[PDB]
Amino acid sequence: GANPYARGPNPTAASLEASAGPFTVRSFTVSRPSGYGAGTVYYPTNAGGTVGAIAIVPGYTARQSSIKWWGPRLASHGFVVITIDTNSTLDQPESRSSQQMAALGQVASLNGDSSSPIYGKVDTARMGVMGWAMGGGGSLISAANNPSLKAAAPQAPWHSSTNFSSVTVPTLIFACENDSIAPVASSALPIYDSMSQNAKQFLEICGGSHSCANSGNSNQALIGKKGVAWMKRFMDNDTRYSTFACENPNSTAVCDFRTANCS
Ligand SMILES: O=C(O)c1ccc(C(=O)OCCO)cc1
């Protein structure tokens, strides 16, 4: 019958482009981080069923502020979102992946903690990974190592190897045209081209610096619609989002669009 994971009203371009989704969001600071530096958990208060969880990691030198906008944007659509600070702001992609996974593990633990605001709010079997730059590379390593993850959506990713041919997890790569830190042509695009087994998409923002998908970006309507639609489609199996997830958005803000194996 019905998809047991579907949450929220039927989507529209306007409802996905809006600053906020349909659910009320609250947040808390993790009192004792397990395996990472610090975290903030964003959650819907009124989703109507258990929701999946997404862990988001910053880039080199960076903190939760760089990635914070995703917490309310995704949680308002029916997700538990943990944004993390790493043990060191100078940790590399492998370590960022371990930390990201440790954060997912703690979100799973908090689902079982009767003192937590997310007690019984999480479907621990449905998880996703995001992150910026080295954190984007960490997210891809997470996906490679943990193929039960349901979706990945890194931004301006970098890793010392571009070979992510082992990834079977649906992966959306946000890229920034004018990235001077992790140039598209040597980083995000080779990573995208490596992936052969999965649903995948590539979305490059015209004129974007390395921070083009960070908090305070000027394309939150398009980037947020894409990120939410990809997570809805693949973490929730929610085919109401198939077109939003798979379409070329036909946008003057998009300077490179690719997709494969999307339905
Ligand atoms: O996470 C980062 O922001 C970060 C990512 C990549 C690099 C880097 O030096 O890549 C070399 C090629 O451009 C440095 C910082």
- Resolution given for this structure, in angstroms: 1.6
Contact 40, 68 (CB under 8 A): yes
Domain ranges of the chain: 13-260
- The protein residue with its alpha carbon nearest to ligand 1, atom 10, reads 182
Output the CA 133–ligand 1 centroid distance in Å. 7
CA distance 254 to 154: 17
Q: Looking at this protein, which amino acid is placed at residue 251?
A: S
Whole-number Å distance, alpha carbon 180 to ligand 1 midpoint, is 9
Structure tokens at 10: 């039927």
Tell the CATH superfamily of the 13-260 domain: Alpha/Beta hydrolase fold, catalytic domain (3.40.50.1820)
DSSP-derived secondary structure for the chain:
---TT--SSPP-HHHHHSSS-SS-EEEEE-SS-SSSSEEEEEEESS-SS-EEEEEEE--TT--HHHHTTHHHHHHTTT-EEEEEE-SSTT--HHHHHHHHHHHHHHHHHHHT-TTSTTTTTEEEEEEEEEEBTHHHHHHHHHHHH-TT--EE--BS---S----TT--S-EEEEEETT-SSS-TTTTHHHHHHH--SS-EEEEEETT--TTTTSTT-S-HHHHHHHHHHHHHHHHS--GGGHHHHHS----TTEEEEEEES--
Ligand 1 binding pocket (C-beta < 6 A) is 59-60, 133-134, 158, 181-183
- The span from the CA of 182 to the CA of 141, in Å, is 17
Greatest Cα-to-Cα distance within the chain, rounded to the nearest angstrom: 49
Question: Which of 60, 86, 95 is the pocket-test mutation for ligand 1 (most atoms within 8 Å of CB)?
Answer: 60
Which tokens hold the place of 234?
């693949």
